[PDB]
Amino acid sequence: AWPKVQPEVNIGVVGHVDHGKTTLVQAITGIWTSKHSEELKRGMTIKLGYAETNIGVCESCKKPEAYVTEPSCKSCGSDDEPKFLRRISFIDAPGAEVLMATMLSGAALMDGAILVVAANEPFPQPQTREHFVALGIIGVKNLIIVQNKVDVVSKEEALSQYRQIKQFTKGTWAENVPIIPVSALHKINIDSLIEGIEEYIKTPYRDLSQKPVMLVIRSFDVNKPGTQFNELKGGVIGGSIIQGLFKVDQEIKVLPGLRVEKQGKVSYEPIFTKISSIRFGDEEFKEAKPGGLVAIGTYLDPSLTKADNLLGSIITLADAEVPVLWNIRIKYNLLERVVGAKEMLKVDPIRAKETLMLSVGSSTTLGIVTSVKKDEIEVELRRPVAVWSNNIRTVISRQIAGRWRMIGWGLVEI
Ligand SMILES: Nc1nc2c(ncn2[C@@H]2O[C@H](COP(=O)(O)OP(=O)(O)NP(=O)(O)O)[C@@H](O)[C@H]2O)c(=O)[nH]1
Ligand SMILES: Nc1nc2c(ncn2[C@@H]2O[C@H](COP(=O)(O)OP(=O)(O)NP(=O)(O)O)[C@@H](O)[C@H]2O)c(=O)[nH]1
Ligand SMILES: [Mg+2]
Numbered sequence: 001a002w003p004k005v006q007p008e009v010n011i012g013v014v015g016h017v018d019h020g021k022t023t024l025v026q027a028i029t030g031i032w033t034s035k036h037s038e039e040l041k042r043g044m045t046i047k048l049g050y051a052e053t054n055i056g057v058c059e060s061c062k063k064p065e066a067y068v069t070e071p072s073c074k075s076c077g078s079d080d081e082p083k084f085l086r087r088i089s090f091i092d093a094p095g096a097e098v099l100m101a102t103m104l105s106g107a108a109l110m111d112g113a114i115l116v117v118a119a120n121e122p123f124p125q126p127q128t129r130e131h132f133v134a135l136g137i138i139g140v141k142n143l144i145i146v147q148n149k150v151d152v153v154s155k156e157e158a159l160s161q162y163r164q165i166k167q168f169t170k171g172t173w174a175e176n177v178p179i180i181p182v183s184a185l186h187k188i189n190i191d192s193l194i195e196g197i198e199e200y201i202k203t204p205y206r207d208l209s210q211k212p213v214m215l216v217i218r219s220f221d222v223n224k225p226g227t228q229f230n231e232l233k234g235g236v237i238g239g240s241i242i243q244g245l246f247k248v249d250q251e252i253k254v255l256p257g258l259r260v261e262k263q264g265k266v267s268y269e270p271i272f273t274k275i276s277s278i279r280f281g282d283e284e285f286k287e288a289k290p291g292g293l294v295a296i297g298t299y300l301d302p303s304l305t306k307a308d309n310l311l312g313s314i315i316t317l318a319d320a321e322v323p324v325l326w327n328i329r330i331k332y333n334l335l336e337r338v339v340g341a342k343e344m345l346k347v348d349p350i351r352a353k354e355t356l357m358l359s360v361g362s363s364t365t366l367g368i369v370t371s372v373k374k375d376e377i378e379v380e381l382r383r384p385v386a387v388w389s390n391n392i393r394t395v396i397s398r399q400i401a402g403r404w405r406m407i408g409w410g411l412v413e414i
Pocket of ligand 2: 220221222223224233236238277278279280281282295296297
Protein backbone atom coordinates (compact mmCIF):
# COMPACT_ATOMS: atom_id res chain seq x y z
CA ALA A 1 0.00 0.00 0.00
CA TRP A 2 0.95 3.66 -0.37
CA PRO A 3 0.97 5.89 2.72
CA LYS A 4 -1.65 8.58 3.27
CA VAL A 5 0.28 11.83 3.58
CA GLN A 6 -0.31 15.47 2.78
CA PRO A 7 1.03 16.81 -0.51
CA GLU A 8 4.58 18.05 -0.09
CA VAL A 9 4.82 20.41 -3.07
CA ASN A 10 2.60 22.88 -4.98
CA ILE A 11 2.91 23.03 -8.76
CA GLY A 12 1.30 26.01 -10.46
CA VAL A 13 -0.36 25.61 -13.84
CA VAL A 14 -0.34 28.83 -15.84
CA GLY A 15 -0.71 30.04 -19.42
CA HIS A 16 -3.00 31.79 -21.88
CA VAL A 17 -6.76 31.33 -21.77
CA ASP A 18 -8.01 27.98 -23.08
CA HIS A 19 -4.53 26.62 -23.72
CA GLY A 20 -5.48 23.56 -21.66
CA LYS A 21 -4.38 24.12 -18.04
CA THR A 22 -7.40 22.57 -16.32
CA THR A 23 -7.54 19.68 -18.78
CA LEU A 24 -3.84 19.04 -18.08
CA VAL A 25 -4.47 18.89 -14.33
CA GLN A 26 -7.31 16.43 -15.05
CA ALA A 27 -5.00 14.25 -17.18
CA ILE A 28 -2.52 14.00 -14.31
CA THR A 29 -4.88 13.72 -11.32
CA GLY A 30 -8.27 12.67 -12.67
CA ILE A 31 -9.81 15.77 -11.06
CA TRP A 32 -11.61 18.65 -12.80
CA THR A 33 -10.64 21.67 -10.69
CA SER A 34 -13.60 23.90 -11.60
CA LYS A 35 -16.22 23.75 -8.84
CA HIS A 36 -18.13 27.03 -9.17
CA SER A 37 -21.41 27.49 -11.06
CA GLU A 38 -20.03 30.37 -13.17
CA GLU A 39 -16.97 28.32 -14.09
CA LEU A 40 -19.06 25.43 -15.38
CA LYS A 41 -21.47 27.69 -17.25
CA ARG A 42 -18.67 29.65 -18.95
CA GLY A 43 -16.24 26.76 -19.40
CA MET A 44 -13.45 28.75 -17.81
CA THR A 45 -11.35 28.87 -14.66
CA ILE A 46 -12.25 31.84 -12.48
CA LYS A 47 -11.09 30.99 -8.96
CA LEU A 48 -7.86 29.14 -8.24
CA GLY A 49 -8.37 25.44 -8.92
CA TYR A 50 -6.83 22.63 -6.87
CA ALA A 51 -6.04 18.92 -7.25
CA GLU A 52 -3.77 16.32 -5.65
CA THR A 53 -2.14 13.08 -6.73
CA ASN A 54 0.26 10.48 -5.44
CA ILE A 55 3.36 9.83 -7.56
CA GLY A 56 5.23 6.55 -7.70
CA VAL A 57 7.64 4.67 -9.92
CA CYS A 58 7.66 1.07 -11.08
CA GLU A 59 11.24 -0.02 -10.47
CA SER A 60 11.04 -2.95 -12.90
CA CYS A 61 9.75 -0.84 -15.80
CA LYS A 62 11.45 1.56 -18.19
CA LYS A 63 10.98 5.32 -18.00
CA PRO A 64 8.83 7.28 -18.61
CA GLU A 65 6.02 4.69 -18.43
CA ALA A 66 7.42 3.58 -15.07
CA TYR A 67 6.00 6.76 -13.51
CA VAL A 68 2.47 6.28 -12.20
CA THR A 69 -0.22 8.16 -10.28
CA GLU A 70 -1.78 5.07 -8.69
CA PRO A 71 -0.33 2.02 -6.90
CA SER A 72 -0.20 -0.28 -9.94
CA CYS A 73 2.43 -1.19 -12.53
CA LYS A 74 0.08 -3.32 -14.67
CA SER A 75 0.22 -0.64 -17.37
CA CYS A 76 3.95 -1.14 -17.91
CA GLY A 77 3.76 -4.92 -17.56
CA SER A 78 4.71 -5.53 -13.94
CA ASP A 79 2.80 -7.15 -11.07
CA ASP A 80 5.03 -5.37 -8.55
CA GLU A 81 3.74 -2.47 -6.47
CA PRO A 82 5.32 0.84 -7.53
CA LYS A 83 7.60 2.63 -5.06
CA PHE A 84 5.85 5.63 -3.52
CA LEU A 85 7.77 8.84 -4.21
CA ARG A 86 5.61 11.71 -2.91
CA ARG A 87 2.19 13.32 -3.01
CA ILE A 88 1.98 16.46 -5.12
CA SER A 89 -0.65 19.11 -5.70
CA PHE A 90 -1.55 21.61 -8.41
CA ILE A 91 -2.57 25.25 -8.21
CA ASP A 92 -4.64 25.74 -11.37
CA ALA A 93 -4.66 29.42 -12.42
CA PRO A 94 -7.15 31.26 -14.64
CA GLY A 95 -5.80 32.32 -18.03
CA ALA A 96 -8.31 35.14 -18.62
CA GLU A 97 -6.54 38.48 -18.93
CA VAL A 98 -9.05 40.12 -16.57
CA LEU A 99 -8.07 37.58 -13.87
CA MET A 100 -4.34 38.25 -13.67
CA ALA A 101 -4.65 39.28 -9.99
CA THR A 102 -6.00 35.81 -9.23
CA MET A 103 -3.08 34.21 -11.05
CA LEU A 104 -0.73 36.40 -8.98
CA SER A 105 -2.39 35.34 -5.72
CA GLY A 106 -1.90 31.72 -6.76
CA ALA A 107 1.73 32.27 -7.73
CA ALA A 108 2.47 33.19 -4.09
CA LEU A 109 1.61 29.55 -3.27
CA MET A 110 3.73 27.85 -5.95
CA ASP A 111 6.89 25.80 -5.36
CA GLY A 112 7.30 25.35 -9.10
CA ALA A 113 5.15 25.70 -12.21
CA ILE A 114 4.06 24.36 -15.54
CA LEU A 115 3.58 26.91 -18.32
CA VAL A 116 1.05 25.44 -20.75
CA VAL A 117 1.49 26.55 -24.39
CA ALA A 118 -1.06 25.48 -27.00
CA ALA A 119 0.64 24.12 -30.13
CA ASN A 120 -2.20 25.34 -32.35
CA GLU A 121 -2.18 29.02 -31.39
CA PRO A 122 0.30 31.74 -32.31
CA PHE A 123 3.19 32.09 -29.88
CA PRO A 124 3.67 33.92 -27.60
CA GLN A 125 0.08 34.86 -26.71
CA PRO A 126 -0.40 37.76 -24.24
CA GLN A 127 -0.88 35.68 -21.08
CA THR A 128 1.81 33.23 -22.13
CA ARG A 129 4.09 36.25 -21.90
CA GLU A 130 2.42 37.75 -18.85
CA HIS A 131 2.32 34.58 -16.75
CA PHE A 132 5.93 33.86 -17.74
CA VAL A 133 7.02 37.31 -16.59
CA ALA A 134 4.98 36.93 -13.39
CA LEU A 135 6.77 33.66 -12.53
CA GLY A 136 10.13 35.36 -12.99
CA ILE A 137 9.16 38.31 -10.80
CA ILE A 138 7.81 36.13 -7.99
CA GLY A 139 10.79 33.79 -8.30
CA VAL A 140 9.01 30.58 -9.29
CA LYS A 141 11.95 29.47 -11.40
CA ASN A 142 11.44 25.71 -11.18
CA LEU A 143 9.54 25.69 -14.45
CA ILE A 144 8.48 23.13 -17.03
CA ILE A 145 7.04 24.32 -20.31
CA VAL A 146 4.38 22.04 -21.67
CA GLN A 147 3.52 22.16 -25.35
CA ASN A 148 -0.14 21.10 -25.28
CA LYS A 149 -2.67 20.14 -28.01
CA VAL A 150 -0.05 18.42 -30.16
CA ASP A 151 -2.89 16.12 -31.29
CA VAL A 152 -4.20 18.84 -33.62
CA VAL A 153 -0.98 20.00 -35.29
CA SER A 154 1.54 18.34 -37.61
CA LYS A 155 4.96 17.23 -36.37
CA GLU A 156 6.50 19.99 -38.47
CA GLU A 157 4.27 22.62 -36.85
CA ALA A 158 5.02 21.34 -33.33
CA LEU A 159 8.75 21.40 -34.01
CA SER A 160 8.58 24.93 -35.47
CA GLN A 161 6.86 26.16 -32.32
CA TYR A 162 9.35 24.23 -30.15
CA ARG A 163 12.19 26.22 -31.71
CA GLN A 164 10.35 29.49 -31.11
CA ILE A 165 9.79 28.59 -27.47
CA LYS A 166 13.51 27.83 -26.98
CA GLN A 167 14.42 31.09 -28.69
CA PHE A 168 11.94 32.92 -26.42
CA THR A 169 13.63 31.54 -23.28
CA LYS A 170 17.14 32.07 -24.70
CA GLY A 171 18.99 34.72 -22.71
CA THR A 172 16.46 34.58 -19.89
CA TRP A 173 16.41 32.92 -16.47
CA ALA A 174 14.41 30.17 -18.17
CA GLU A 175 16.99 29.37 -20.88
CA ASN A 176 17.44 25.77 -19.69
CA VAL A 177 13.78 25.00 -18.92
CA PRO A 178 12.56 21.74 -20.52
CA ILE A 179 9.77 21.68 -23.08
CA ILE A 180 7.53 18.61 -22.92
CA PRO A 181 4.95 18.00 -25.67
CA VAL A 182 1.64 16.44 -24.60
CA SER A 183 -2.02 16.07 -25.40
CA ALA A 184 -3.93 16.79 -22.18
CA LEU A 185 -7.22 15.90 -23.88
CA HIS A 186 -6.09 12.47 -25.09
CA LYS A 187 -3.64 11.87 -22.22
CA ILE A 188 -0.62 11.49 -24.48
CA ASN A 189 2.95 11.63 -23.07
CA ILE A 190 1.64 12.41 -19.60
CA ASP A 191 4.16 9.94 -18.15
CA SER A 192 7.02 12.02 -19.57
CA LEU A 193 5.54 15.07 -17.84
CA ILE A 194 5.38 13.21 -14.51
CA GLU A 195 9.04 12.26 -14.96
CA GLY A 196 9.78 15.91 -15.71
CA ILE A 197 7.98 17.02 -12.57
CA GLU A 198 10.13 14.64 -10.48
CA GLU A 199 13.34 15.89 -12.11
CA TYR A 200 12.73 19.62 -12.41
CA ILE A 201 10.25 20.42 -9.64
CA LYS A 202 11.81 18.83 -6.61
CA THR A 203 10.28 19.34 -3.20
CA PRO A 204 11.98 22.43 -1.77
CA TYR A 205 13.68 22.64 1.59
CA ARG A 206 11.27 23.74 4.32
CA ASP A 207 11.81 25.56 7.61
CA LEU A 208 9.59 23.98 10.24
CA SER A 209 11.03 26.11 13.06
CA GLN A 210 9.90 29.40 11.58
CA LYS A 211 6.80 31.08 13.00
CA PRO A 212 3.84 29.33 11.36
CA VAL A 213 2.22 31.31 8.54
CA MET A 214 -0.62 30.26 6.25
CA LEU A 215 -1.74 32.35 3.26
CA VAL A 216 -5.53 32.17 2.95
CA ILE A 217 -7.14 31.68 -0.46
CA ARG A 218 -10.44 29.99 0.46
CA SER A 219 -12.93 30.04 3.28
CA PHE A 220 -16.11 27.98 3.57
CA ASP A 221 -19.27 27.17 5.42
CA VAL A 222 -19.00 23.37 5.38
CA ASN A 223 -22.49 22.64 6.71
CA LYS A 224 -24.84 20.83 4.31
CA PRO A 225 -28.64 20.29 4.27
CA GLY A 226 -30.04 17.07 5.72
CA THR A 227 -27.34 16.78 8.39
CA GLN A 228 -27.86 16.05 12.09
CA PHE A 229 -26.52 18.56 14.63
CA ASN A 230 -23.97 15.90 15.63
CA GLU A 231 -22.05 16.46 12.38
CA LEU A 232 -22.38 20.26 12.04
CA LYS A 233 -19.14 22.29 12.18
CA GLY A 234 -17.53 25.72 12.56
CA GLY A 235 -16.05 27.74 9.70
CA VAL A 236 -13.26 26.34 7.54
CA ILE A 237 -10.31 28.30 6.20
CA GLY A 238 -8.27 27.09 3.25
CA GLY A 239 -4.78 27.99 2.11
CA SER A 240 -1.09 27.23 1.89
CA ILE A 241 1.32 26.96 4.81
CA ILE A 242 4.43 28.80 3.67
CA GLN A 243 6.54 28.24 6.80
CA GLY A 244 6.41 26.40 10.11
CA LEU A 245 3.58 24.05 10.90
CA PHE A 246 0.15 24.00 12.47
CA LYS A 247 -1.42 21.41 14.77
CA VAL A 248 -4.95 20.55 15.88
CA ASP A 249 -5.94 22.37 19.11
CA GLN A 250 -3.51 25.23 18.50
CA GLU A 251 -4.61 28.77 19.30
CA ILE A 252 -4.40 30.79 16.09
CA LYS A 253 -5.40 34.17 14.70
CA VAL A 254 -6.56 35.46 11.33
CA LEU A 255 -4.96 38.70 10.15
CA PRO A 256 -5.87 41.45 9.44
CA GLY A 257 -9.18 40.03 10.70
CA LEU A 258 -12.73 41.38 10.53
CA ARG A 259 -13.73 44.84 9.30
CA VAL A 260 -15.42 46.55 12.25
CA GLU A 261 -16.06 49.96 13.75
CA LYS A 262 -13.85 51.21 16.56
CA GLN A 263 -13.89 54.81 17.81
CA GLY A 264 -15.80 56.20 14.84
CA LYS A 265 -13.25 54.74 12.45
CA VAL A 266 -12.91 51.60 10.37
CA SER A 267 -10.68 49.02 12.01
CA TYR A 268 -9.66 45.42 11.54
CA GLU A 269 -10.05 43.16 14.54
CA PRO A 270 -7.82 40.04 14.60
CA ILE A 271 -9.93 36.89 14.59
CA PHE A 272 -8.89 34.52 17.37
CA THR A 273 -9.88 30.89 17.24
CA LYS A 274 -8.59 27.35 17.69
CA ILE A 275 -7.83 24.65 15.13
CA SER A 276 -10.57 22.03 15.39
CA SER A 277 -9.43 19.86 12.47
CA ILE A 278 -6.94 19.66 9.61
CA ARG A 279 -7.71 18.21 6.16
CA PHE A 280 -5.93 17.82 2.85
CA GLY A 281 -8.34 16.68 0.15
CA ASP A 282 -10.43 13.94 1.74
CA GLU A 283 -7.96 12.99 4.48
CA GLU A 284 -7.72 14.22 8.06
CA PHE A 285 -4.41 14.88 9.80
CA LYS A 286 -3.22 16.04 13.20
CA GLU A 287 -0.72 18.53 11.83
CA ALA A 288 -0.10 20.48 8.64
CA LYS A 289 3.15 21.47 6.94
CA PRO A 290 4.04 23.39 3.79
CA GLY A 291 2.87 21.74 0.58
CA GLY A 292 -0.72 21.29 -0.55
CA LEU A 293 -3.74 23.44 0.18
CA VAL A 294 -4.92 22.71 3.70
CA ALA A 295 -8.44 23.04 5.10
CA ILE A 296 -8.24 24.41 8.65
CA GLY A 297 -11.36 23.71 10.69
CA THR A 298 -12.12 26.31 13.34
CA TYR A 299 -14.70 27.08 16.00
CA LEU A 300 -15.73 30.25 14.18
CA ASP A 301 -19.31 31.08 13.28
CA PRO A 302 -19.50 29.79 9.66
CA SER A 303 -20.94 33.16 8.62
CA LEU A 304 -17.43 34.58 9.10
CA THR A 305 -15.87 32.18 6.60
CA LYS A 306 -18.68 31.74 4.06
CA ALA A 307 -17.98 32.42 0.37
CA ASP A 308 -14.22 33.09 0.58
CA ASN A 309 -14.76 35.97 3.02
CA LEU A 310 -11.22 35.62 4.38
CA LEU A 311 -9.41 35.38 1.02
CA GLY A 312 -6.13 37.30 1.23
CA SER A 313 -5.77 36.91 4.99
CA ILE A 314 -3.02 35.07 6.79
CA ILE A 315 -3.18 32.73 9.75
CA THR A 316 -0.49 32.69 12.44
CA LEU A 317 -0.27 31.42 15.99
CA ALA A 318 -2.24 33.54 18.49
CA ASP A 319 0.87 35.03 20.11
CA ALA A 320 2.82 35.76 16.92
CA GLU A 321 3.88 39.35 16.27
CA VAL A 322 2.85 40.26 12.72
CA PRO A 323 2.73 43.78 11.25
CA VAL A 324 -0.69 44.75 9.91
CA LEU A 325 -0.17 47.88 7.85
CA TRP A 326 -2.52 50.45 6.36
CA ASN A 327 0.44 52.30 4.85
CA ILE A 328 3.32 50.50 3.19
CA ARG A 329 6.71 51.50 1.80
CA ILE A 330 7.87 49.62 -1.31
CA LYS A 331 11.36 49.44 -2.82
CA TYR A 332 10.24 48.98 -6.42
CA ASN A 333 11.26 48.34 -10.00
CA LEU A 334 9.18 48.86 -13.14
CA LEU A 335 8.85 46.58 -16.14
CA GLU A 336 9.91 48.16 -19.43
CA ARG A 337 6.58 47.42 -21.05
CA VAL A 338 3.05 46.14 -20.47
CA VAL A 339 3.48 42.48 -21.38
CA GLY A 340 -0.14 41.33 -20.97
CA ALA A 341 -1.71 43.65 -23.55
CA LYS A 342 -2.24 42.56 -27.16
CA GLU A 343 0.05 45.43 -28.07
CA MET A 344 2.91 45.90 -25.59
CA LEU A 345 3.12 49.60 -24.69
CA LYS A 346 5.78 51.38 -22.64
CA VAL A 347 5.28 51.61 -18.86
CA ASP A 348 4.91 55.17 -17.55
CA PRO A 349 6.65 56.19 -14.30
CA ILE A 350 4.61 55.97 -11.11
CA ARG A 351 3.06 59.29 -10.06
CA ALA A 352 1.79 60.58 -6.74
CA LYS A 353 -2.01 60.19 -6.32
CA GLU A 354 -2.16 57.20 -8.69
CA THR A 355 -4.40 54.34 -7.55
CA LEU A 356 -2.38 51.15 -7.81
CA MET A 357 -3.17 47.47 -7.23
CA LEU A 358 -0.81 45.63 -4.87
CA SER A 359 -0.41 41.86 -4.74
CA VAL A 360 1.05 40.74 -1.41
CA GLY A 361 0.98 37.06 -0.50
CA SER A 362 -2.52 35.88 -1.39
CA SER A 363 -3.95 39.37 -0.89
CA THR A 364 -4.95 41.95 -3.50
CA THR A 365 -5.44 45.57 -2.39
CA LEU A 366 -5.92 48.97 -3.97
CA GLY A 367 -4.06 51.97 -2.59
CA ILE A 368 -3.15 55.57 -3.36
CA VAL A 369 0.45 56.56 -4.01
CA THR A 370 1.29 59.16 -1.35
CA SER A 371 5.01 59.42 -2.16
CA VAL A 372 7.27 58.66 -5.12
CA LYS A 373 11.07 58.55 -5.21
CA LYS A 374 13.62 56.90 -7.49
CA ASP A 375 13.59 53.52 -5.76
CA GLU A 376 10.73 53.93 -3.32
CA ILE A 377 6.99 54.49 -3.12
CA GLU A 378 4.65 54.88 -0.17
CA VAL A 379 1.07 53.67 -0.56
CA GLU A 380 -2.06 54.32 1.49
CA LEU A 381 -4.16 51.16 1.25
CA ARG A 382 -7.95 50.70 1.25
CA ARG A 383 -7.53 47.69 3.54
CA PRO A 384 -4.52 46.83 5.72
CA VAL A 385 -2.18 44.00 4.74
CA ALA A 386 -0.52 41.42 6.98
CA VAL A 387 3.25 41.52 6.38
CA TRP A 388 4.72 38.46 8.06
CA SER A 389 8.39 38.95 7.17
CA ASN A 390 10.83 41.60 6.03
CA ASN A 391 11.24 42.08 2.26
CA ILE A 392 8.16 40.19 1.14
CA ARG A 393 7.61 40.38 -2.64
CA THR A 394 4.83 42.60 -3.96
CA VAL A 395 3.59 42.88 -7.53
CA ILE A 396 2.34 46.25 -8.74
CA SER A 397 -0.48 46.71 -11.24
CA ARG A 398 -1.93 49.80 -12.92
CA GLN A 399 -5.27 50.23 -14.69
CA ILE A 400 -4.44 50.72 -18.38
CA ALA A 401 -7.17 50.97 -21.03
CA GLY A 402 -9.74 49.61 -18.58
CA ARG A 403 -7.70 46.62 -17.43
CA TRP A 404 -5.44 45.96 -14.45
CA ARG A 405 -1.95 45.36 -15.84
CA MET A 406 1.17 44.20 -14.08
CA ILE A 407 3.74 47.02 -14.38
CA GLY A 408 6.33 46.35 -11.70
CA TRP A 409 7.35 44.69 -8.49
CA GLY A 410 9.10 45.37 -5.24
CA LEU A 411 9.92 44.59 -1.65
CA VAL A 412 7.66 45.66 1.19
CA GLU A 413 9.98 47.40 3.62
CA ILE A 414 9.28 47.05 7.34
N1 LIG B 1 -7.42 19.08 -29.08
C1 LIG B 1 -7.15 19.37 -27.80
N2 LIG B 1 -7.98 20.17 -27.12
C2 LIG B 1 -7.56 20.36 -25.85
C3 LIG B 1 -6.44 19.86 -25.23
N3 LIG B 1 -6.36 20.30 -23.91
C4 LIG B 1 -7.41 21.05 -23.77
N4 LIG B 1 -8.18 21.15 -24.91
C5 LIG B 1 -9.42 21.88 -25.06
O1 LIG B 1 -9.18 23.26 -24.88
C6 LIG B 1 -10.33 23.87 -24.23
C7 LIG B 1 -9.87 24.61 -22.99
O2 LIG B 1 -9.41 23.67 -22.01
P1 LIG B 1 -9.13 24.15 -20.53
O3 LIG B 1 -8.43 23.00 -19.92
O4 LIG B 1 -10.46 24.54 -19.99
O5 LIG B 1 -8.14 25.34 -20.70
P2 LIG B 1 -7.70 26.36 -19.64
O6 LIG B 1 -6.33 26.76 -20.02
O7 LIG B 1 -7.84 25.70 -18.31
N5 LIG B 1 -8.71 27.62 -19.70
P3 LIG B 1 -8.77 28.84 -18.66
O8 LIG B 1 -7.64 29.79 -19.01
O9 LIG B 1 -10.05 29.61 -18.89
O10 LIG B 1 -8.62 28.24 -17.31
C8 LIG B 1 -11.33 22.74 -24.00
O11 LIG B 1 -12.28 22.65 -25.07
C9 LIG B 1 -10.42 21.51 -23.97
O12 LIG B 1 -11.10 20.30 -24.22
C10 LIG B 1 -5.57 19.00 -25.96
O13 LIG B 1 -4.54 18.45 -25.57
N6 LIG B 1 -6.02 18.81 -27.27
N1 LIG C 1 -10.56 20.79 8.48
C1 LIG C 1 -11.69 20.40 7.89
N2 LIG C 1 -11.85 20.62 6.60
C2 LIG C 1 -13.04 20.16 6.16
C3 LIG C 1 -14.03 19.53 6.88
N3 LIG C 1 -15.10 19.21 6.06
C4 LIG C 1 -14.75 19.64 4.89
N4 LIG C 1 -13.51 20.23 4.87
C5 LIG C 1 -12.84 20.82 3.71
O1 LIG C 1 -13.53 21.98 3.32
C6 LIG C 1 -13.59 22.06 1.87
C7 LIG C 1 -15.04 22.07 1.42
O2 LIG C 1 -15.75 20.94 1.92
P1 LIG C 1 -16.85 20.21 1.04
O3 LIG C 1 -17.77 19.52 1.97
O4 LIG C 1 -16.11 19.36 0.07
O5 LIG C 1 -17.64 21.28 0.29
P2 LIG C 1 -18.57 22.26 0.98
O6 LIG C 1 -18.40 22.11 2.45
O7 LIG C 1 -19.93 22.04 0.44
N5 LIG C 1 -18.13 23.73 0.56
P3 LIG C 1 -19.06 24.67 -0.30
O8 LIG C 1 -20.36 24.89 0.44
O9 LIG C 1 -18.24 25.91 -0.54
O10 LIG C 1 -19.43 23.88 -1.53
C8 LIG C 1 -12.75 20.90 1.36
O11 LIG C 1 -11.41 21.34 1.14
C9 LIG C 1 -12.84 19.89 2.50
O12 LIG C 1 -11.75 18.99 2.55
C10 LIG C 1 -13.84 19.30 8.26
O13 LIG C 1 -14.60 18.75 9.07
N6 LIG C 1 -12.61 19.78 8.70
MG1 LIG D 1 -8.70 26.46 -16.50
